[PDB]
């Protein structure tokens, strides 16, 4: 490609008995018997052996008369594999393993004083891949850069967390809330107040997750 190699062949490691990496029991005589079957033309094409053998006749007889597939399958798949423990998770009584980076319910974070973290930089709206985040912002009565409306259409929101990734003041976050099933498609259209309440409900775990994530590069 971009470099030059002289010896095209990559030689196998030296198999000397005195080699430090000489792998004892690398080849097993009880296992490596492929040399016996290395000449089988049937494994290489539609042709058959130049002369059939009593071994082949006996194998075909076992395959056909005995019908041994059923017995072997019942013994292995049923009796043996039925004895393993259950991997099912008690969903109503327990929760599955959720990673810290779980992009859950979109929410609006805030500073510890409670002031709005959103600085109306429009980064979330310019970063929503489907433009699922809508912002309408005007100067605040005190003069702060805050939006008069902040809407997230969950019908068109992929819950991707890109707004959180590109958030300039850590305002938009993806809380662990995943049970956000809505009985109304209109109710699914979350807004500024709804997002603020959702962040208020789950701020603590969100704060712990934020601290842990910041500590990752710190």
């Amino acid at each position: 490609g971009y470099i030059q190699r002289s010896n095209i062949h990559e030689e196998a490691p030296n198999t000397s008995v005195e080699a430090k990496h000489h792998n004892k029991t690398f080849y097993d005589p009880i296992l490596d018997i492929d040399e016996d079957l290395k000449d089988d033309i049937r494994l290489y094409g539609r042709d058959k052996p130049d002369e059939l053998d009593f071994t082949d006749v006996w194998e075909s007889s076992y395959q056909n008369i005995i019908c041994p597939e059923y017995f072997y399958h019942f013994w292995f798949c049923g009796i043996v594999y039925s004895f393993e423990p259950e991997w099912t998770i008690n969903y109503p009584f327990e929760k599955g393993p959720l990673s810290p980076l779980f992009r859950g319910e979109h929410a609006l974070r805030r500073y510890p004083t409670g002031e709005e973290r959103c600085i109306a930089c429009k980064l979330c709206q310019s970063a929503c891949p489907a433009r699922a985040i809508t912002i309408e912002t005007e100067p605040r009565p005190d003069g702060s850069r805050r939006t008069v409306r902040y809407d997230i259409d969950m019908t068109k929101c992929i819950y991707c967390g890109f707004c959180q990734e590109a958030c300039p003041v850590d305002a938009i976050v993806e809380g662990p809330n995943y049970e956000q099933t809505a009985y109304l498609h209109e109710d699914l259209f979350y807004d500024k107040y709804k997002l603020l309440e959702n962040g208020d409900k789950w701020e603590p775990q969100i704060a712990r997750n934020i601290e842990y994530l910041i500590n990752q590069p710190l």
């Binding site: 792998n23 296992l31 494994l43």
Partner: peptide, 19 residues
Amino acid sequence: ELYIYKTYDMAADDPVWRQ
């Protein structure tokens, strides 16, 4: 070099896999 399924363990059917 032919890999032939011969044993009940596919890993045993390949020396590299067993290693």
